[PDB]
Design a protein around this ligand. Structure first.
Ligand SMILES: Nc1ncnc2c1ncn2[C@@H]1O[C@H](COP(=O)(O)OP(=O)(O)NP(=O)(O)O)[C@@H](O)[C@H]1O
Ligand SMILES: [Mg+2]
Length: 341
Protein backbone atom coordinates (compact mmCIF):
# COMPACT_ATOMS: atom_id res chain seq x y z
CA UNK A 1 0.00 0.00 0.00
CA UNK A 2 3.11 2.28 -0.05
CA UNK A 3 3.61 4.96 -2.69
CA UNK A 4 5.60 3.54 -5.62
CA UNK A 5 8.61 5.70 -6.58
CA UNK A 6 10.55 5.72 -9.86
CA UNK A 7 13.55 7.73 -11.07
CA UNK A 8 14.19 8.84 -14.67
CA UNK A 9 17.58 10.28 -15.66
CA UNK A 10 17.42 12.37 -18.89
CA UNK A 11 20.32 12.33 -21.36
CA UNK A 12 22.90 15.15 -21.35
CA UNK A 13 21.61 17.79 -23.83
CA UNK A 14 23.61 19.35 -26.72
CA UNK A 15 24.70 22.39 -24.65
CA UNK A 16 25.91 20.11 -21.76
CA UNK A 17 27.70 17.90 -24.35
CA UNK A 18 29.52 20.86 -25.95
CA UNK A 19 31.01 22.09 -22.62
CA UNK A 20 31.72 18.40 -21.61
CA UNK A 21 29.61 18.47 -18.37
CA UNK A 22 30.77 15.82 -15.84
CA UNK A 23 28.19 12.95 -15.89
CA UNK A 24 28.11 11.85 -12.22
CA UNK A 25 24.71 10.07 -12.08
CA UNK A 26 24.42 6.42 -13.28
CA UNK A 27 21.51 3.92 -13.38
CA UNK A 28 22.70 0.42 -12.33
CA UNK A 29 20.49 -2.60 -12.94
CA UNK A 30 16.77 -2.07 -12.92
CA UNK A 31 16.28 -0.27 -9.58
CA UNK A 32 19.39 1.65 -8.51
CA UNK A 33 20.67 5.17 -9.11
CA UNK A 34 24.25 5.98 -8.02
CA UNK A 35 26.34 9.15 -7.88
CA UNK A 36 30.06 8.93 -8.64
CA UNK A 37 33.03 11.01 -7.32
CA UNK A 38 34.47 13.29 -10.06
CA UNK A 39 38.11 12.54 -9.03
CA UNK A 40 38.13 8.67 -8.91
CA UNK A 41 34.71 7.42 -10.23
CA UNK A 42 34.02 5.72 -6.82
CA UNK A 43 30.31 5.52 -5.76
CA UNK A 44 29.36 8.25 -3.27
CA UNK A 45 25.57 7.58 -3.05
CA UNK A 46 23.24 4.71 -3.96
CA UNK A 47 19.42 4.99 -3.92
CA UNK A 48 17.01 2.11 -4.67
CA UNK A 49 13.58 2.70 -6.30
CA UNK A 50 10.70 0.57 -7.60
CA UNK A 51 12.43 1.09 -10.98
CA UNK A 52 15.18 3.39 -12.29
CA UNK A 53 15.28 4.54 -15.94
CA UNK A 54 18.51 5.62 -17.52
CA UNK A 55 19.18 8.08 -20.34
CA UNK A 56 18.44 5.49 -23.13
CA UNK A 57 15.03 4.62 -21.52
CA UNK A 58 12.04 4.54 -23.90
CA UNK A 59 8.62 6.29 -23.41
CA UNK A 60 6.87 2.86 -23.98
CA UNK A 61 8.89 1.21 -21.10
CA UNK A 62 8.25 4.06 -18.59
CA UNK A 63 4.51 3.72 -19.40
CA UNK A 64 4.60 -0.12 -19.22
CA UNK A 65 6.28 -0.23 -15.78
CA UNK A 66 4.76 2.82 -14.04
CA UNK A 67 1.28 3.39 -15.48
CA UNK A 68 -0.07 0.30 -17.25
CA UNK A 69 -0.62 -1.59 -13.90
CA UNK A 70 -2.82 1.32 -12.61
CA UNK A 71 -5.24 1.06 -15.56
CA UNK A 72 -6.59 -2.19 -14.11
CA UNK A 73 -6.99 -0.53 -10.68
CA UNK A 74 -8.90 2.51 -12.17
CA UNK A 75 -11.28 0.02 -13.91
CA UNK A 76 -11.75 -1.69 -10.49
CA UNK A 77 -12.90 1.60 -8.83
CA UNK A 78 -9.59 2.88 -7.36
CA UNK A 79 -8.38 6.50 -7.34
CA UNK A 80 -4.87 6.43 -8.94
CA UNK A 81 -2.30 9.27 -9.25
CA UNK A 82 0.98 9.55 -11.12
CA UNK A 83 3.01 12.74 -10.62
CA UNK A 84 6.34 13.79 -12.15
CA UNK A 85 8.58 15.74 -9.80
CA UNK A 86 12.05 17.30 -10.24
CA UNK A 87 14.37 20.19 -11.22
CA UNK A 88 13.44 22.46 -14.18
CA UNK A 89 14.42 20.91 -17.54
CA UNK A 90 14.84 17.29 -16.31
CA UNK A 91 12.04 15.69 -18.37
CA UNK A 92 8.75 15.93 -16.49
CA UNK A 93 6.62 17.16 -19.42
CA UNK A 94 8.49 14.88 -21.87
CA UNK A 95 7.61 11.96 -19.57
CA UNK A 96 3.99 12.89 -18.71
CA UNK A 97 2.76 14.28 -22.07
CA UNK A 98 5.53 14.39 -24.70
CA UNK A 99 5.36 16.40 -27.98
CA UNK A 100 4.02 14.06 -30.78
CA UNK A 101 0.16 13.90 -31.07
CA UNK A 102 -1.15 10.26 -30.96
CA UNK A 103 -2.45 8.66 -34.21
CA UNK A 104 -6.07 7.39 -33.72
CA UNK A 105 -4.62 4.00 -34.65
CA UNK A 106 -1.59 3.78 -32.26
CA UNK A 107 -1.24 1.44 -29.21
CA UNK A 108 -0.02 2.34 -25.66
CA UNK A 109 2.72 -0.33 -26.40
CA UNK A 110 4.14 1.55 -29.46
CA UNK A 111 7.82 2.58 -29.37
CA UNK A 112 7.50 6.38 -30.08
CA UNK A 113 8.16 9.79 -28.38
CA UNK A 114 4.56 9.98 -27.07
CA UNK A 115 4.39 10.24 -23.22
CA UNK A 116 2.09 8.89 -20.51
CA UNK A 117 -1.24 10.84 -20.88
CA UNK A 118 -1.97 9.70 -24.50
CA UNK A 119 -0.87 6.10 -23.78
CA UNK A 120 -3.15 6.00 -20.67
CA UNK A 121 -6.17 7.34 -22.69
CA UNK A 122 -5.49 4.82 -25.50
CA UNK A 123 -5.11 1.93 -22.99
CA UNK A 124 -8.27 2.85 -21.04
CA UNK A 125 -10.43 2.95 -24.23
CA UNK A 126 -8.88 -0.36 -25.40
CA UNK A 127 -9.95 -1.98 -22.08
CA UNK A 128 -13.41 -0.32 -21.92
CA UNK A 129 -14.11 -1.48 -25.59
CA UNK A 130 -13.93 -5.13 -24.39
CA UNK A 131 -15.89 -4.76 -21.12
CA UNK A 132 -19.49 -5.96 -20.76
CA UNK A 133 -20.47 -2.77 -18.90
CA UNK A 134 -22.12 0.61 -19.35
CA UNK A 135 -19.61 3.40 -18.66
CA UNK A 136 -19.20 7.16 -18.73
CA UNK A 137 -15.75 8.88 -19.00
CA UNK A 138 -15.32 12.57 -18.08
CA UNK A 139 -12.05 14.51 -18.50
CA UNK A 140 -10.83 17.60 -16.72
CA UNK A 141 -7.57 19.49 -17.19
CA UNK A 142 -6.68 21.89 -14.36
CA UNK A 143 -3.78 24.34 -14.12
CA UNK A 144 -2.39 25.90 -10.94
CA UNK A 145 -0.50 29.05 -11.98
CA UNK A 146 0.92 31.58 -9.48
CA UNK A 147 -1.51 29.99 -6.87
CA UNK A 148 -4.61 30.53 -9.07
CA UNK A 149 -6.70 27.67 -10.59
CA UNK A 150 -7.38 27.73 -14.39
CA UNK A 151 -9.52 25.32 -16.47
CA UNK A 152 -7.43 24.34 -19.56
CA UNK A 153 -10.60 23.03 -21.34
CA UNK A 154 -12.58 26.37 -21.00
CA UNK A 155 -12.77 28.49 -24.24
CA UNK A 156 -13.29 31.76 -22.25
CA UNK A 157 -12.52 33.49 -18.87
CA UNK A 158 -16.26 33.40 -17.97
CA UNK A 159 -16.33 30.67 -15.17
CA UNK A 160 -14.70 31.03 -11.69
CA UNK A 161 -12.81 27.91 -10.29
CA UNK A 162 -13.00 27.35 -6.49
CA UNK A 163 -11.57 24.57 -4.25
CA UNK A 164 -13.51 23.27 -1.20
CA UNK A 165 -11.96 20.85 1.38
CA UNK A 166 -14.08 17.70 0.78
CA UNK A 167 -17.20 15.68 1.79
CA UNK A 168 -17.60 12.20 3.54
CA UNK A 169 -14.10 11.13 2.25
CA UNK A 170 -12.91 13.83 4.81
CA UNK A 171 -9.36 14.02 3.26
CA UNK A 172 -10.16 15.28 -0.29
CA UNK A 173 -11.14 18.41 -2.37
CA UNK A 174 -14.14 19.50 -4.52
CA UNK A 175 -13.31 21.86 -7.47
CA UNK A 176 -16.38 23.98 -8.37
CA UNK A 177 -16.65 25.28 -11.97
CA UNK A 178 -14.07 22.98 -13.54
CA UNK A 179 -15.31 21.42 -16.86
CA UNK A 180 -15.86 17.60 -16.59
CA UNK A 181 -16.25 16.87 -20.29
CA UNK A 182 -17.88 13.60 -21.40
CA UNK A 183 -15.78 11.77 -24.05
CA UNK A 184 -16.92 8.80 -26.13
CA UNK A 185 -13.78 8.01 -28.21
CA UNK A 186 -9.96 8.25 -28.33
CA UNK A 187 -10.49 10.96 -31.05
CA UNK A 188 -12.59 13.01 -28.60
CA UNK A 189 -9.96 12.85 -25.76
CA UNK A 190 -6.98 13.42 -28.13
CA UNK A 191 -8.77 16.59 -29.43
CA UNK A 192 -9.30 17.80 -25.79
CA UNK A 193 -5.69 17.06 -24.70
CA UNK A 194 -4.38 18.97 -27.73
CA UNK A 195 -6.64 22.04 -27.01
CA UNK A 196 -5.69 22.03 -23.33
CA UNK A 197 -1.98 21.57 -24.08
CA UNK A 198 -2.02 24.75 -26.19
CA UNK A 199 -3.47 26.75 -23.21
CA UNK A 200 -0.74 25.68 -20.67
CA UNK A 201 1.42 28.48 -19.25
CA UNK A 202 4.89 27.90 -20.70
CA UNK A 203 8.15 29.83 -21.34
CA UNK A 204 10.70 29.33 -24.19
CA UNK A 205 13.89 28.66 -22.06
CA UNK A 206 17.35 27.52 -23.38
CA UNK A 207 17.31 23.61 -23.59
CA UNK A 208 13.76 23.86 -22.06
CA UNK A 209 11.80 25.47 -24.89
CA UNK A 210 8.36 24.54 -23.42
CA UNK A 211 9.30 25.06 -19.68
CA UNK A 212 6.13 24.51 -17.56
CA UNK A 213 5.32 27.71 -15.61
CA UNK A 214 2.27 25.99 -13.98
CA UNK A 215 1.40 22.67 -12.34
CA UNK A 216 -1.13 20.72 -14.46
CA UNK A 217 -3.49 17.85 -13.52
CA UNK A 218 -5.20 15.75 -16.23
CA UNK A 219 -8.00 13.75 -14.56
CA UNK A 220 -9.98 10.86 -16.08
CA UNK A 221 -13.09 9.74 -14.16
CA UNK A 222 -14.87 6.52 -15.21
CA UNK A 223 -18.32 5.40 -13.92
CA UNK A 224 -18.73 1.62 -14.70
CA UNK A 225 -22.08 -0.21 -14.14
CA UNK A 226 -21.79 -4.00 -14.69
CA UNK A 227 -24.33 -5.53 -17.20
CA UNK A 228 -28.07 -5.49 -7.33
CA UNK A 229 -26.50 -3.37 -10.16
CA UNK A 230 -22.86 -2.66 -9.12
CA UNK A 231 -21.50 0.87 -9.90
CA UNK A 232 -17.70 1.49 -9.56
CA UNK A 233 -16.06 4.92 -9.96
CA UNK A 234 -12.37 4.91 -11.00
CA UNK A 235 -10.11 7.98 -11.30
CA UNK A 236 -6.73 8.51 -12.90
CA UNK A 237 -4.90 11.75 -12.12
CA UNK A 238 -1.87 12.44 -14.30
CA UNK A 239 0.13 15.30 -12.82
CA UNK A 240 2.93 17.29 -14.45
CA UNK A 241 4.58 19.57 -11.85
CA UNK A 242 6.59 22.72 -12.75
CA UNK A 243 10.33 22.22 -11.90
CA UNK A 244 12.34 23.58 -8.96
CA UNK A 245 15.19 25.95 -9.72
CA UNK A 246 18.32 26.76 -7.62
CA UNK A 247 17.84 30.50 -7.07
CA UNK A 248 15.59 39.16 -11.62
CA UNK A 249 12.40 41.15 -11.18
CA UNK A 250 9.28 40.33 -13.17
CA UNK A 251 6.62 37.71 -13.80
CA UNK A 252 9.41 35.13 -14.44
CA UNK A 253 10.87 35.56 -10.91
CA UNK A 254 7.33 35.61 -9.31
CA UNK A 255 6.64 32.28 -11.11
CA UNK A 256 9.97 30.83 -9.86
CA UNK A 257 9.16 31.95 -6.27
CA UNK A 258 5.63 30.44 -6.41
CA UNK A 259 6.85 27.17 -8.08
CA UNK A 260 9.72 26.76 -5.58
CA UNK A 261 7.43 27.58 -2.53
CA UNK A 262 4.69 25.10 -3.64
CA UNK A 263 7.45 22.40 -4.12
CA UNK A 264 8.97 23.23 -0.73
CA UNK A 265 5.47 22.70 0.76
CA UNK A 266 5.24 19.31 -1.08
CA UNK A 267 8.64 18.38 0.48
CA UNK A 268 7.36 19.44 3.96
CA UNK A 269 4.24 17.26 3.39
CA UNK A 270 6.44 14.24 2.40
CA UNK A 271 8.74 14.84 5.43
CA UNK A 272 5.78 15.26 7.86
CA UNK A 273 4.23 11.99 6.60
CA UNK A 274 7.48 9.96 6.83
CA UNK A 275 8.60 11.55 10.18
CA UNK A 276 4.98 10.95 11.50
CA UNK A 277 4.65 14.62 12.62
CA UNK A 278 1.14 15.31 14.06
CA UNK A 279 0.38 18.16 11.54
CA UNK A 280 0.85 17.48 7.81
CA UNK A 281 0.89 20.94 6.18
CA UNK A 282 -1.34 20.14 3.17
CA UNK A 283 -3.23 23.43 3.50
CA UNK A 284 -0.01 25.53 3.17
CA UNK A 285 -0.18 25.26 -0.66
CA UNK A 286 -2.96 24.89 -3.28
CA UNK A 287 -0.68 22.17 -4.80
CA UNK A 288 -0.65 20.08 -1.60
CA UNK A 289 -4.42 20.67 -1.17
CA UNK A 290 -4.86 19.09 -4.66
CA UNK A 291 -2.35 16.26 -3.95
CA UNK A 292 -3.61 15.64 -0.35
CA UNK A 293 -5.66 12.52 -1.26
CA UNK A 294 -2.62 11.13 -3.18
CA UNK A 295 -0.18 11.58 -0.20
CA UNK A 296 -1.17 9.26 2.73
CA UNK A 297 -4.79 9.10 1.44
CA UNK A 298 -7.21 6.74 -0.37
CA UNK A 299 -5.27 6.47 -3.66
CA UNK A 300 -2.69 4.32 -5.40
CA UNK A 301 0.09 6.81 -6.09
CA UNK A 302 3.20 6.55 -8.17
CA UNK A 303 5.90 9.20 -8.34
CA UNK A 304 8.35 9.73 -11.23
CA UNK A 305 11.32 11.76 -9.93
CA UNK A 306 13.27 13.25 -12.90
CA UNK A 307 16.93 14.19 -12.62
CA UNK A 308 19.81 15.54 -14.69
CA UNK A 309 23.08 13.49 -14.83
CA UNK A 310 25.38 16.63 -14.71
CA UNK A 311 27.65 17.66 -11.77
CA UNK A 312 26.40 21.31 -12.19
CA UNK A 313 22.93 20.05 -11.00
CA UNK A 314 24.05 17.60 -8.22
CA UNK A 315 22.59 19.69 -5.28
CA UNK A 316 19.13 19.85 -7.00
CA UNK A 317 19.44 16.17 -8.07
CA UNK A 318 20.32 15.01 -4.48
CA UNK A 319 17.32 17.01 -3.09
CA UNK A 320 15.01 15.29 -5.60
CA UNK A 321 16.52 11.83 -4.89
CA UNK A 322 16.36 12.34 -1.10
CA UNK A 323 12.65 13.46 -1.19
CA UNK A 324 11.84 10.56 -3.61
CA UNK A 325 13.72 7.98 -1.43
CA UNK A 326 11.71 9.16 1.67
CA UNK A 327 8.33 9.15 -0.18
CA UNK A 328 8.68 5.32 -0.66
CA UNK A 329 7.84 5.06 3.07
CA UNK A 330 4.42 6.87 2.71
CA UNK A 331 1.56 4.43 3.39
CA UNK A 332 -1.66 5.03 1.43
CA UNK A 333 -5.03 3.35 2.14
CA UNK A 334 -6.64 2.78 -1.29
CA UNK A 335 -10.34 1.82 -1.27
CA UNK A 336 -12.73 0.77 -4.09
CA UNK A 337 -15.39 3.42 -4.84
CA UNK A 338 -18.45 1.13 -5.21
CA UNK A 339 -21.67 3.18 -4.75
CA UNK A 340 -23.72 -0.11 -4.50
CA UNK A 341 -26.73 0.74 -6.93
N1 LIG B 1 14.39 11.32 -21.94
C1 LIG B 1 14.62 12.34 -22.74
N2 LIG B 1 15.16 12.09 -23.96
C2 LIG B 1 15.36 13.14 -24.78
N3 LIG B 1 15.07 14.44 -24.60
C3 LIG B 1 14.57 14.64 -23.37
C4 LIG B 1 14.30 13.68 -22.43
N4 LIG B 1 13.75 14.27 -21.30
C5 LIG B 1 13.68 15.55 -21.59
N5 LIG B 1 14.17 15.84 -22.84
C6 LIG B 1 14.24 17.13 -23.45
O1 LIG B 1 14.67 18.08 -22.50
C7 LIG B 1 13.90 19.30 -22.64
C8 LIG B 1 13.21 19.62 -21.33
O2 LIG B 1 12.23 18.59 -21.10
P1 LIG B 1 10.83 18.85 -20.40
O3 LIG B 1 10.25 17.48 -20.23
O4 LIG B 1 10.04 19.89 -21.05
O5 LIG B 1 11.35 19.41 -19.00
P2 LIG B 1 10.53 19.70 -17.66
O6 LIG B 1 11.12 18.87 -16.54
O7 LIG B 1 9.06 19.57 -17.91
N6 LIG B 1 10.88 21.27 -17.43
P3 LIG B 1 10.09 22.31 -16.47
O8 LIG B 1 8.67 22.29 -16.88
O9 LIG B 1 10.59 23.71 -16.70
O10 LIG B 1 10.26 21.91 -15.03
C9 LIG B 1 12.94 19.08 -23.80
O11 LIG B 1 13.44 19.60 -25.02
C10 LIG B 1 12.85 17.56 -23.90
O12 LIG B 1 12.58 17.13 -25.22
MG1 LIG C 1 7.57 20.78 -17.82
Amino acid sequence: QNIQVYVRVRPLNSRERCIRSAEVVDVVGPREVVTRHTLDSKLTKKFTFDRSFGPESKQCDVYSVVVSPLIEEVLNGYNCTVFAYGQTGTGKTHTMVGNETAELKSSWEDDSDIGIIPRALSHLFDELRMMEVEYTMRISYLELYNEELCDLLSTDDTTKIRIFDDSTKKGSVIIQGLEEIPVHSKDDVYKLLEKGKERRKTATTLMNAQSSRSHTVFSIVVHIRENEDMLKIGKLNLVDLAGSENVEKGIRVRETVNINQSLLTLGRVITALVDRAPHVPYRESKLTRLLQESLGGRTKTSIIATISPGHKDIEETLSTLEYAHRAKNIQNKPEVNQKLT
